[PDB]
């Protein structure tokens, strides 16, 4: 009918409008415009199972004269996701001498995470918990088996001779009380706390996300 | 002595990051992050499109997709970028035409100059 | 407006969890008094227990008084005392791995985590005096007792942050570890209490949970396991046990109390 | 639904190719 022709006309105007918007965006991109990613970020697009860590060690030793200090992690557990064998066989004990590790375990993967970081060579010394929040100011309660889950846990190991002028003591807090944003996006307060712990250091981030690229962090991820 | 993280980041990005994440000097490629994953127009893709326009005609971007880019590309994006690098919103008058590189640049500049005094250039695009 | 600020709205649970009076009848508790719990054979005193709450106070510094991981190793748990149940034990950041290792040595597997976010009644008055500057000069403890709390719309600056060599301590963790039996099946009540609640505290006493907070913990345990509560058929066969008990809140209906050197 | 895909959180290129596919399908089913 003529109504289908009118729908064709409407989709023609919509195509022209969105074509103009696309041309505007691609003309602005090929000009002076920067994204939300900082200029000092180091993103690496590689799967950890296939990534050659020796090249990373050589580059870090060449261009910094030392090694990493924080190896913050957030592994995709099986419960794309990968098995715990690959996470345990990763070369973390070769990526650090004197530093910390942040693992961001879940409730179903708590004891195995503790065993993993004790097998890498670290000693469990601290724990950081993220208590979720609502817009009104209450706790965003969820669900679970025995109790309603409204928390997220980060397990912290230590290694080597940490006590120097590099790392600082008695800083920040274990509890991050902040709203849940994104799909699975940890708050920026953990990055602020890390920068309070080791100011002007070298950091590594495994299983990193485009939403959490930072101006002092080497970040490895697959969608990065 | 302390180190500066600008040169350190550029040096790390030179040998660790991919060719699309950083430039030749080591500076961050913001165009890669301003789009989604996978939908990024590479400088190799632009040269591939121009070489396909050199070889085959305009408006028959099926063989161009088949044996130019990867065997699989976006037919819509090929048309949009061909319109953008010709300076003209709609390429109806260019259908079936095979244009060289120099003549392509001349046609683009001629369209830009034609629309400059016609009050038509909206973000380097001529409307008709 | 009252009742809408973050502090007065996060501590709204305290109006319903009033601790009860002590049970006058003798057949509602056990009240065992011993000398050394770790050397004590609890299997003689109590039968099958569904909930074992260990109210242990850890020793972590050189001068700090309390119990240790070696004292936890010397404590005896067998299938006679608890064959199908849950252990609630106060854990610490320094000895979490040792605690879970020694408890998995006795057949108890980690299940869940229930913690208390510490809020300072001293920092509340300090922040009130800092921001506002007539009722703010009384006591940081009478405000706990009278429940007259100052308004606070940003609670993250009120946390008890005790001294540490790392990130400052601002929480109290109660671990839950369950002995999975095979033939039997343990009665549960899923999702009746959140694994987090805020509670007021003292800056000088970070390890002393309030009476209402301990009431909240006790009602969480009793709501989690409903057939372990006091009833007619549970007389003489109480299924809830306490280790290192205190006279503050432990004489309770349906609860076995084991004291240390009264 | 065109009004659904236009007001969605889609980027300006997936919107554009959805619009082109819809236009091609409706012109094909109009002509034939």
* Three-state secondary structure string covering chain C: CCCCCHHHHHCCHHHCCCCCCCCCCHHHECCEEECCCCCCCHHHHCCCCCEEEECCCECCCCCCCCECHHHHHHCCCCCCCCCCEEEEEEECCCCHHHHHHHHHCCCCEEEEEEEEEEEEHHHHHHHHHHHHCCCCCCCCCHHHHHCCCCCCCCHHHCECCECCCCCCECEEEEEEEEECCCCCCCCCCCCCCECEEEEEECCCCCCCCCHHHHHHHHHHHHHHCCCCCCCCCCCCCCCEEEECCCCCCCCCCCEEEEEECC
Instruction: Count chain A–chain B contacts defined by CB atoms under 8 A.
Output: 81
The answer to whether A218 touches A204, Cβ cutoff 8 Å, is: yes
Question: A7: which chain D residues are within 8 Å (Cβ-Cβ)?
Answer: 2, 26
What is the Cα–Cα distance from C146 to C41, expressed in whole angstroms? 42
Interface of A with C (CB under 8 A): 107, 110-111, 114, 118, 124-129, 131, 136-139, 141, 143-151, 153, 156, 169-175, 177, 193, 197
The answer to whether A107 touches A135, Cβ cutoff 8 Å, is: no
The answer to whether B37 touches A223, Cβ cutoff 8 Å, is: yes
* Experimental determination approach used: cryo-EM
Q: Which residues of A are annotated as a binding site for S-adenosyl-L-homocysteine?
A: 47-48, 184, 186, 209, 211-212, 222-223
The answer to whether A48 touches A207, Cβ cutoff 8 Å, is: yes
User: Which tokens sit at C242?
Assistant: 């306490």
**A77-110 burial, b if ≥16 CB within 10 A, otherwise e?**
beeeeeebeebeebebeebbebbbbbbbbebebb
Secondary structure (3-state) at D23: helix
DSSP state of B95: T
Secondary structure (3-state) at A126: strand
**Strand A151-158 to strand A123-133: parallel, antiparallel, or no bridges (unpaired)?**
antiparallel
Asked if B80 is an interface residue toward chain A (Cβ–Cβ < 8 A), one would say yes
Asked if D22 is an interface residue toward chain B (Cβ–Cβ < 8 A), one would say no
Q: Which residue has the tokens 């274990």?
A: A174
What is the Cα–Cα distance from A117 to A123, expressed in whole angstroms? 7
Give the bridge partners for A203, in sequence order. A70, A217
Question: C167: which chain A residues are within 8 Å (Cβ-Cβ)?
Answer: 126, 128, 156, 171-174, 193, 197
| Contact between chains at D12 and A12 (C-beta distance less than 8 A) | no
Q: In 3D, which of A155, A157, A144 has the Cα closest to residue A108?
A: A144
Question: D23: which chain A residues are within 8 Å (Cβ-Cβ)?
Answer: 8, 11-12, 15
- SS3 helix, strand, coil % of chain B, rounded to 5? 50, 5, 45
Query: Where does residue B17 rank: exposed (0-12), middle (13-18), buried (19+ CB within 10 A)?
Result: buried
What is the Cα–Cα distance from C148 to A208, expressed in whole angstroms? 46
| Resolution of the experimental structure, in angstroms | 2.8
Across the beta sheet with A42-45, the strand order is A42-45, A217-221, A203-206, A68-70, A96-102, A151-158, A123-133, A175-179
Rg (CA), chain D: 11
What is the Cα–Cα distance from C238 to C255, expressed in whole angstroms? 6
* C-alpha dist (Å) from residue A207 to A46, A129, A204: 10, 19, 10
Q: Which residues of A are annotated as a binding site?
A: 47-48, 184, 186, 209, 211-212, 222-223
Helix segments in A91-212, DSSP class H: 111-120, 189-197
- SS3 helix, strand, coil % of chain D, rounded to 5? 70, 0, 30
Secondary structure (3-state) at A109: helix
Secondary structure (3-state) at A167: coil
* C-alpha dist (Å) from residue C23 to C246, C255, C260: 15, 11, 21
CB within 8 Å of D30: residues ≥ 6 apart:
A4, A5, A8
What is the Cα–Cα distance from C201 to C141, expressed in whole angstroms? 9
Tell me which residue in C111, C166, C194 faces A150 most closely, judged by beta carbons.
C194
CB within 8 Å of D26: residues ≥ 6 apart:
A4, A7, A8, A11
User: Which tokens sit at A27?
Assistant: 């003309």
Give the bridge partners for A45, in sequence order. A221
Distance of CA C177 to the CA centre of its chain: 14
C and B: touch, per 3+ CB pairs < 8 A? no
Q: In 3D, which of B8, B34, B6, B5 has the Cα closest to residue B21?
A: B34
Question: B17: which chain A residues are within 8 Å (Cβ-Cβ)?
Answer: 42-45
Tell me which residue in A23, A40, A218 faces B123 most closely, judged by beta carbons.
A23
């Amino acid at each position: 009918k003529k109504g289908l022709q009118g729908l064709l006309q409407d989709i023609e105007k919509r195509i022209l409008h969105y074509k103009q918007l696309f041309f505007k965006e691609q003309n602005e991109i090929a000009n002076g415009k920067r994204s939300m990613v900082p200029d000092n970020s180091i993103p690496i697009c590689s799967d950890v199972t296939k990534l050659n860590f020796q090249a990373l060690i050589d580059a870090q030793m060449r261009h910094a004269g030392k090694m990493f200090d924080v190896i913050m992690m957030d592994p995709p557990w099986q419960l794309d996701s990968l098995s715990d064998e690959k996470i345990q066989n990763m070369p973390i004990q070769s990526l650090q001498q004197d530093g910390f590790i942040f693992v961001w375990a879940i409730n179903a993967k708590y004891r195995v995470t503790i065993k993993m970081i004790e097998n890498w060579g670290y000693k469990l010394v601290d724990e950081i918990t993220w208590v979720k929040k609502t817009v009104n100011g209450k706790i965003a309660k969820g669900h679970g088996f025995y109790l309603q889950h409204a928390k997220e846990s980060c397990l912290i190991g230590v290694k080597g001779d940490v006590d120097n002028g590099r790392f600082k003591k008695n800083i920040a807090s274990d509890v991050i009380f902040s709203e849940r944003r994104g799909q699975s996006q940890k708050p920026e307060e953990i990055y602020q706390y890390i920068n309070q712990l080791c100011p002007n250091g070298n950091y590594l981030e495994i299983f990193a996300r485009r939403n959490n690229l930072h101006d002092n962090w080497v970040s490895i991820g697959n969608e990065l | 002595q302390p180190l500066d993280f600008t040169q350190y980041a550029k040096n790390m990005r030179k040998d660790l990051s991919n060719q699309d994440i950083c430039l030749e000097d080591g500076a961050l490629n913001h165009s890669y992050f301003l789009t989604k994953k996978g939908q990024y127009w590479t400088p190799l893709n632009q040269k591939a499109l121009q070489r396909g326009i050199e070889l085959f005609g305009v408006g028959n971007w099926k063989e161009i997709n088949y044996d130019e880019f990867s065997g699989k590309a976006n037919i819509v994006e090929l048309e949009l970028r061909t319109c953008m690098i010709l300076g003209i919103n709609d390429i109806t008058e260019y259908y079936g035409k095979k244009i060289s590189e120099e003549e392509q640049e001349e046609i683009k500049k001629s369209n830009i100059a034609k629309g400059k005094k016609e009050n038509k250039l909206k973000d380097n695009i001529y409307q008709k | 407006e009252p009742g809408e600020d973050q502090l007065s709205l996060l501590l709204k649970w305290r109006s319903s969890y009033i601790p009860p009076q002590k049970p006058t009848n003798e057949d509602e508790y056990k009240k065992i008094i011993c000398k050394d719990i770790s050397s004590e054979k609890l299997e003689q005193h109590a039968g099958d227990v569904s909930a074992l709450f260990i109210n242990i106070k850890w020793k972590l510094s050189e001068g700090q008084s309390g119990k240790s991981i070696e004292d936890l190793k010397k404590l005896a748990i067998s299938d006679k005392l608890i064959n199908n149940g849950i252990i609630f034990i106060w854990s610490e950041k320094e000895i979490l791995s040792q605690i879970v290792d020694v408890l998995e040595a006795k057949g108890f597997n980690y299940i869940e985590n229930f913690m208390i976010n510490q809020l300072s009644a001293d920092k509340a008055l300090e922040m009130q005096r800092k921001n506002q500057n007539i009722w703010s000069d009384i006591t940081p403890e009478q405000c706990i007792e009278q429940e007259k709390f100052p308004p606070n719309n940003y609670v993250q600056d009120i946390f008890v942050n005790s001294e540490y060599s790392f990130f400052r301590k601002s929480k109290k963790i109660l671990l839950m570890l369950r002995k999975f039996n095979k033939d039997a099946q343990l009665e549960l009540r899923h999702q009746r209490t959140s694994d987090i609640f805020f509670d007021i505290f003292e800056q000088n006493k970070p390890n002393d949970v309030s009476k209402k907070g301990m009431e909240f913990v006790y009602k969480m345990i009793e709501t989690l396991l409903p057939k372990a509560n006091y009833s007619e058929e549970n007389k003489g066969a109480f299924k809830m046990m306490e280790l290192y008990a205190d006279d503050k809140s432990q004489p309770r209906k349906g609860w076995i109390s084991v004291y240390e050197q009264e | 639904t065109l009004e659904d895909i236009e007001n969605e959180k889609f980027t300006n290129l997936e919107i554009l190719t959805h619009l082109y596919n819809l236009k091609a399908e409706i012109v094909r089913r109009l002509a034939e």
